[PDB]
Design a protein around this ligand. Structure first.
Ligand SMILES: Nc1ncnc2c1ncn2[C@@H]1O[C@H](COP(=O)(O)O)[C@@H](O)[C@H]1O
Ligand SMILES: Nc1ncnc2c1ncn2[C@@H]1O[C@H](COP(=O)(O)O)[C@@H](O)[C@H]1O
Ligand SMILES: [Cl-]
Ligand SMILES: [Cl-]
Ligand SMILES: [Cl-]
Ligand SMILES: [Cl-]
Ligand SMILES: [Mg+2]
Ligand SMILES: [Mg+2]
Lengths: 419, 419
């Protein structure tokens, strides 16, 4: 039985980034860049007006002038030179005609006469005003994105700016998932027979892996039969998946075949971890027959222990395989809203609902946590709406309301419900 | 020109939750529940062993006993009664045979004899030990999930536990997106002609809306022609979308037709907002001809202003339409890592890269922010890797390094890179 920090170190050490692939622009969203991106031309590639108004010779100053061209896009005003004593109409983003060196916004002008257009410039501007010189936003050949950078909406915008519609990225791993147990029935089952429960772990893990943006291979319910489980594991290993997640069949039962099968097919690095919830957690590395590595997590059957182990150990593995340079979860410090009794032996991943408050109970703003109630590993209601796992050290003491603890954030911080 | 708080209030007031729909279990992930979910049977539905070991009569105490049945699942041990002086083998989750009232884990036992199985119980247990009574995790008819609750991995697990594979939820809105401008070319363009730039806003917004888990209707580049834009807007309004996002054609240019077209087709509530970056932002409500409401955001053309307006105004609208009870973004308080000059008029949404530190500069842990550099609205590099918008009030003063500010978190807090 090893501590969680060592189990994490072992997993990190074995887990290797996947080979990069080439994807389309919209397929690159959420993925980590596997190449630098350089701008092939400047932004703007022509001197561009910041305003709707008139391009002028700054030294002319206030006065009445003829409008000699109109420039909004493309070739508008090509071959026209704005000489002293003339102006040109411009819209925001419109090319500045040759000879003009400043823009006066339309609010500081007035159109004069009926019909040959004439405008009155009402201010004394300065050379360069309200003009974006060539490459002022992005210089030609500048690096706009680098290897190891995750692609979000702004990064897609930068790729589109640079004319990149096919992108070299690190792919997401493909994850196979199965449930084990003679007591399991499908979640479509209505009336349950004696000694049956619905398989909840498989759908829970399919959803958890879909939230990590990975493809899922659903291998269904497997019975507590060594030959049957070996066949499904052999089929999973040869299918091309990168990660296998099983649940159950990893405790001390006489028909728990996941750990001995993983010892036979590959290298098991650990089967037990010092923590609450649970204890059994097998991690193995299997070589597929040519040729590649498959990581296997023999997750515990208890629904809570299953999802907590997915959150602490599988999520950083998915991220490492997908090329994340920072795969660890966000850890914050927070104050307890109620007292919690800590265990004298097992450090606990206590489920909580956390929120940011203007006063965290100490007079200054901060996160605060509410427990989800009873933490028994069989009680999936303790995971309901939990957006954090409080890291409670094994002291045996009651942590009073208002005391500060470390907390792992397990669900979208941008999706946090406000206080 | 109205303040951002009033523009937000107006948007919230007009935006209505979409009618609920029925979806499959995996389609319900990310969606908000539109019904309560009750457990049709208890969990566990039979007295279940917490351990792999032996079910006993607690009052028997330590001694040697015959093993009269084995119980792992289903009908194992049905019709067998564990009487005083007998025991039954059990695995975790296995049904407790009639007459047994406690479980002794296999570690506190030893098998005796060769071959008729016999076991030695090594401890004095207590009635109820290591048994999950019927409904101890979930009682029959208990409410396991409620209306207004967002479905994540644990909630999918609870739906599977309760045998619910078709779920009543609030759907995501469908969003139409178009770009405007005679200066635009597709992002596939190689060498640019004079006065052209690649359309970056459309792909940026398509990606931003895909991150909000909404279906996208890509309506492409529209030119600065009033009849052409009216036709594309009429087609968008009649297509069945809930939200329309345009960008550009909303400043003071003589070919900016988005605002006058939105005034003609529906009700425009505002066209200008007091903020930095930018200023133009049209919001309108259109009635589709029978019959439903379509919300239109005439977003600014400047890439930064376009994405910031999407983040502050469109994201809470998507969430309100999708039935979120808490659609506002997470706001935290943080310390500046560098000095920032605030504007004397326009309150700013200053882009920053924020991280949680053990020491935020004041001796206690907290978030800290680094500016992304120059904040010009034409500079999409200022959005690069920005996970927050610092809310800088319009004071005209320099906010020194170490001063605290309010910050809107705009990207996954669970995806935050650690310090
Ligand atoms: N799709 C787009 N991608 C990049 N820049 C744009 C886009 N649409 C408009 N712009 C720019 O945003 C600014 C304001 O646009 P407008 O409001 O149409 O004058 C101008 O500099 C435009 O060139
Ligand atoms: N797919 C599943 N869904 C819900 N509970 C499960 C699942 N698989 C195993 N369990 C339960 O988790 C506990 C430990 O499983 P095991 O390690 O197979 O003994 C037992 O109470 C099982 O009934
Ligand atoms: Cl039945
Ligand atoms: Cl436990
Ligand atoms: Cl060309
Ligand atoms: Cl601006
Ligand atoms: Mg089992
Ligand atoms: Mg335009």
């Amino acid at each position: 039985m090893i501590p969680t920090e060592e189990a994490l170190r072992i997993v990190f050490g074995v887990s290797k980034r996947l080979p990069p692939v080439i994807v389309s622009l919209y397929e690159a969203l959420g993925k980590v860049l596997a190449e630098d991106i350089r701008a092939p031309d400047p932004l703007p590639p022509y001197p561009a007006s910041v305003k709707d108004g008139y391009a002028v010779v700054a030294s002319d100053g206030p006065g009445e002038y003829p409008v000699i061209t109109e420039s909004r896009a493309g070739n508008d005003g090509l071959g026209v030179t704005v000489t002293p004593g003339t102006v040109a109409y411009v819209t925001t983003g419109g090319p500045i005609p040759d000879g003009a060196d400043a823009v006066v916004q339309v609010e500081d002008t007035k159109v004069i006469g009926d019909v040959s257009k004439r405008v009155k410039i009402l201010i004394q501007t300065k050379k360069g005003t309200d003009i974006r010189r060539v490459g002022c936003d992005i210089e030609k050949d500048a690096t706009v994105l680098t290897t190891g950078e995750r692609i979000g909406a702004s990064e897609i915008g930068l790729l589109a700016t640079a004319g990149v519609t096919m992108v070299k990225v690190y792919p997401m791993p493909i994850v196979a998932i199965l449930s084990t147990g003679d007591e399991l029935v499908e979640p479509t089952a209505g009336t349950l027979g004696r000694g049956q429960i619905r398989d909840s772990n498989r759908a829970m893990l399919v959803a958890a892996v879909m939230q990590q943006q990975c493809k899922v291979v659903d291998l269904g319910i497997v019975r507590d039969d060594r030959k049957e489980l070996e066949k499904v594991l052999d089929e999973a290993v040869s299918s091309g998946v990168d990660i296998i997640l099983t649940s159950g069949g990893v405790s001390m039962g006489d028909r728990d075949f996941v750990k001995p099968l993983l010892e036979e097919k590959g290298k098991v690095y650990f089967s037990k971890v010092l923590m609450a919830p649970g204890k059994p957690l097998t991690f193995a590395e299997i070589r597929a027959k040519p040729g590649k590595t498959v990581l296997a997590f023999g997750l515990p059957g208890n629904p809570v222990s299953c999802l907590v182990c997915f959150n602490i150990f599988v999520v950083p593995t998915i991220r490492q395989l997908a090329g994340w340079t920072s795969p660890h979860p966000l850890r914050v410090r927070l104050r307890l809203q109620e007292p919690i009794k800590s265990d004298p032996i097992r450090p606990e991943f206590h489920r909580a609902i956390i929120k940011w408050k203007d006063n965290d109970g100490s007079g200054t703003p901060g996160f605060v946590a509410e427990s989800t109630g009873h933490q028994m590993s069989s009680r999936l209601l303790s995971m309901r709406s939990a957006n954090a796992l409080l890291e409670l050290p094994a002291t045996g003491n009651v942590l009073s309301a208002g005391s500060s603890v470390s907390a792992i954030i397990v669900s979208d911080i941008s999706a946090f419900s406000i206080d």
